[PDB]
Amino acid sequence: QILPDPSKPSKRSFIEDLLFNKVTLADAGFIKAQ
Amino acid sequence: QVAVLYQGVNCTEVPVAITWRVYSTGSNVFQTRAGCLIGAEH
């Protein structure tokens, strides 16, 4: 549950996925509301 | 020698940037998530 999971585009573990879903970014910004 | 990064631009509109336009000749224009890089070989 903490080692990488090869079956994802980003080689993230399970708990890392949970953590990345719990936090919701605001006005992140990319190459293109701003 | 130098390279130029127009940052935050999908460089289809940069060919007409606006003084100097020596570099737009290019032939090695490259597109990165930070912008468009001109004068550097990939």
Ligand SMILES: *[C@@H]1O[C@H](CO)[C@@H](O)[C@H](O)[C@H]1NC(C)=O
């Ligand atoms: C940049 O513009 C072209 C056409 O103007 C478009 O096809 C391309 O998807 C754009 N770049 C991105 C990252 O969307």
